[PDB]
Write a structure and sequence with these properties.
The chain is mainly beta. It contains two helices and 14 strands; from the N terminus they run E-E-E-E-E-E-E-E-E-E-H-E-E-E-E-H. It has helices at residues 155-158, 230-239, and strands spanning 5-6, 15-22, 25-36, 39-42, 53-57, 70-79, 95-99, 127-131, 146-149, 152-153, 172-175, 191-196, 199-208, 221-225. The N and C termini lie far apart (33 Å). The protein binds chloride ion. Serine proteases that hydrolyze many proteins in addition to elastin. It comes from Sus scrofa. Keywords: Calcium, Disulfide bond, Hydrolase, Metal-binding, Protease, Secreted, Serine protease, Signal, Zymogen.
C-alpha cells in the first residue's frame, strides 16, 4: 500500500497474508479475505504459480511475532473458471482457498462481510485498501499491515479514456487514483473495505495497478467486484 498508514491491529480482522514457501522460510505474496473459518477469498492471479501456499490469519507484522497469528495450509484452490492469466483486464480475478484447518475466530481473526450481490458503490464511496504490499512503486513490502483511504471511482469515470479505458470492466471496482495512495505489489488478493450503512464490507479483491506504477494519477487501483461473485462464491463453498 503506497501512502498508507499503519492499521490498528484489530481493525481489519478478515485480512490474511497468503504466503508461499521459499527455502526454509515463507514469503508473503498476496493478501486475501477470510470468508469462512476454512475459506479465503483472494485473487486468482495470486495462485497462478504452482507454489506451496499457506495462509496467516491474525497477522499484523510480517517480521515480528504478534502473538495472534494462526498458520494454516491451503488444502484446495478454486480459481474462477473464466480466469485467464494472460488477461487480467478480462476480470474473473478471484479464487477461493479451502484451508486445511478451520481457524479460530477472535478479535484478530474474523470473517469478512461481503456485499449483497449486484451492489455497486456510488462514485467517491469511502473505502480503505489494506495490505502488506509495496509501500512505494518498485519498493518493498510493508512489515506492518497498512491501510490507505481510497474512495471509489465509478465505472463511468474509471473506464473513461483518461482513466483505465476499456481495461476496466463493470465486474471491477476502481478506487483511489489520486497519485499518492494506492495498492501496490503484494496487496493483490486483499480486500477493499467500504463503509456502507455503517458497516465495512469487502467490496473488492485487489487485482491490478498500472504497469507505470502503483500510485499513478488517474490509474486507480482496480479490484475484482466482490458483489459480482456472490453466487459463484456460494456455489464453490457449497460444493466443496
Ligand atoms: Cl475485516
Amino acid at each position: 500500500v503506497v501512502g498508507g498508514t499503519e492499521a490498528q491491529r484489530n481493525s481489519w480482522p478478515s485480512q490474511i497474508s497468503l504466503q508461499y514457501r521459499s527455502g526454509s522460510s515463507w514469503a508473503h505474496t498476496c493478501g486475501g479475505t477470510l470468508i469462512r473459518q476454512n475459506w479465503v477469498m483472494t485473487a486468482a492471479h495470486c495462485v497462478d504459480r504452482e507454489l506451496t501456499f499457506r495462509v496467516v490469519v491474525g497477522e499484523h507484522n510480517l517480521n515480528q511475532n504478534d502473538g495472534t497469528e494462526q498458520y494454516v495450509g491451503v488444502q484446495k484452490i478454486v480459481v474462477h473458471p473464466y480466469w485467464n492469466t494472460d488477461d487480467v483486464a478480462a476480470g474473473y480475478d478471484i479464487a477461493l482457498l479451502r484451508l486445511a484447518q478451520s481457524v479460530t475466530l477472535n478479535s484478530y481473526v474474523q470473517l469478512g462481510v461481503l456485499p449483497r450481490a449486484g451492489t455497486i458503490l456510488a462514485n467517491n464511496s469511502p473505502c480503505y485498501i489494506t495490505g502488506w504490499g509495496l509501500t512505494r512503486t518498485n519498493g518493498q513490502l510493508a512489515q506492518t499491515l497498512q491501510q490507505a483511504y481510497l474512495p471509489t471511482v465509478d465505472y463511468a469515470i474509471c473506464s473513461s479514456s483518461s482513466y483505465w479505458g476499456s481495461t476496466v470492466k463493470n465486474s471491477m471496482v476502481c478506487a483511489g487514483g489520486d497519485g499518492v495512495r494506492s495498492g501496490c505489489q503484494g496487496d493483490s488478493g486483499g480486500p477493499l473495505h467500504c463503509l456502507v450503512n455503517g458497516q465495512y464490507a469487502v467490496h473488492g479483491v485487489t487485482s491490478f495497478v498500472s504497469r507505470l506504477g502503483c500510485n499513478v494519477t488517474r490509474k486507480p487501483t482496480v479490484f475484482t467486484r466482490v458483489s459480482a461473485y456472490i453466487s459463484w462464491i456460494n456455489n464453490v463453498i457449497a460444493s466443496n
